[PDB]
Amino acid sequence: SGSGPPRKVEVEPLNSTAVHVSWKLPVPHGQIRGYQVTYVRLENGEPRGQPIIQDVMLAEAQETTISGLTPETTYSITVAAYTTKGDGARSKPKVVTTTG
Numbered sequence: 001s002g003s004g005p006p007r008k009v010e011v012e013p014l015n016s017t018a019v020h021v022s023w024k025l026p027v028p029h030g031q032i033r034g035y036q037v038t039y040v041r042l043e044n045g046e047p048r049g050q051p052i053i054q055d056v057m058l059a060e061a062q063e064t065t066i067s068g069l070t071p072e073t074t075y076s077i078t079v080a081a082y083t084t085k086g087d088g089a090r091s092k093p094k095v096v097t098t099t100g
């Protein structure tokens, strides 16, 4: 509502407990104050447990590392901007599974 989604979200695995998430600026709305990276464990494709929100509270932000993940575990990741007119649209989920 406050903005379109972050564009070209990418996930790069780092190790069995961490992945690197990056994105491009939403299409130029409210003014961007930061980004909300949300991830949730999936079990057989279904979300399980509370989603975890990692705030990246720089308007210039375009990346963050999610760490403390469990090995051999599947996660669904979305990104949304925080704006002066409320949350932006969330990106479509990107789903990855950590190595062993």
Ligand SMILES: OC[C@@H](O)[C@@H](O)[C@H](O)[C@@H](O)CO
Binding pocket: 041, 042, 043, 044, 045, 072, 073, 074, 075, 097
């Ligand atoms: O489709 C993959 C499967 O559901 C698995 O990766 C779970 O996320 C993991 O077993 C968590 O216990």
